Amino acid sequence: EQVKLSVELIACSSFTPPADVEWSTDVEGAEALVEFAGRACYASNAAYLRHIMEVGHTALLEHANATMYIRGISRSATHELVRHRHFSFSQLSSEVVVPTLIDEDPQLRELFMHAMDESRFAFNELLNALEEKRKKQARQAARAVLPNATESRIVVSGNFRTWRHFIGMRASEHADVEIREVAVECLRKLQVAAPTVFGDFEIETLADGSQMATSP
């Protein structure tokens, strides 16, 4: 069965100022935390976070964290995701993800889904023969025939700087296609959660229908 990408923001930083500190702000949560961390080194929130980014003191963004639950991401794009070492992961220990270039062609999709069945048939058949004559090891041996398109479900956490770095690298290049879509959907959720920290990124749709994000 074919599944599509679904990214859900499941965690963000909840902020509470210290009682004795004389300080108030217009925003609530992670952006108030980044503002507190900035002022703690020595007008409004959005004006202040614009200045942090302008001077490029991104070490302050490391206090705010966000967690994503990502579904409908292939094993290969999950491998590209875990290459980013400053994230923490929890991965799922049948569903299949089809590349956009194949999905937009019904002829190619029919052939892709046929190959997905072939792999599943080969997996089931090998697993049976392995369990005929320890069974945890029979499953992980049989999994060797499973394609890169196999859907994985992953919980991913990192600070705002780690996110800004992931988006800035993946949502810009072309190359690769799936990891872009993941990065654009992550940014979109982060722009709802933290408008100013992630407002410099501009989401645009390309000629071929896929989206990308760039920053000056």
Secondary structure of 46-103 in HEC code, one letter for each residue: HHHHHHHHHHCCHHHHHCCEEEEEEEEEEHHHHHHHHCCCCCEEEECCCCECCCHHHH
| φ and ψ at residue 208, rounded to 5 degrees | -85, 0
Give the three-class secondary structure for 132: helix
Resolution limit, Å = 2.6
Binding residue positions for dUMP: 80-83, 91-93, 143, 170
**Alpha-carbon span 214 to 216, nearest angstrom:** 7
The DSSP bridge pattern shows strands 151-159 and 65-74 to be: antiparallel
Method by which this entry was solved: X-ray
Binding residue positions for FAD: 83-85, 91, 159-161, 165
Give the three-class secondary structure for 159: strand
Binding residue positions: 80-85, 91-93, 143, 159-161, 165, 170
How many Å is the Cα radius of gyration of the chain? 21
**Alpha-carbon span 141 to 129, nearest angstrom:** 11
The DSSP bridge pattern shows strands 6-12 and 65-74 to be: antiparallel
- Provide the token pair at 26: 């217009």
- 198, 187 contact by CB (below 8 A): yes
Residues ≥6 apart with Cβ < 8 Å to 117: none
Which residue do the tokens 């994000």 mark? 213
The length of the chain, given as a count of residues? 216
CA atoms within a 13 Å half-sphere pointing along the CA-CB vector of 40: 11
Bridge partners, 120 (sequence order): none
Domains and CATH numbers, the chain: 1-12+65-103+147-216 (3.30.70.3180), 13-64 (6.10.140.450), 104-146 (6.10.140.440)
| φ and ψ at residue 33, rounded to 5 degrees | -65, -45
- Provide the token pair at 53: 């980014």
**Alpha-carbon span 67 to 87, nearest angstrom:** 10
Which residue in 49, 78, 68 sits closest to 190, CA to CA?
A: 68
Residues annotated catalytic, as ranges: 170
Give the three-class secondary structure for 194: coil
- Provide the token pair at 47: 């004006």
**Alpha-carbon span 88 to 157, nearest angstrom:** 5
**Alpha-carbon span 56 to 165, nearest angstrom:** 13
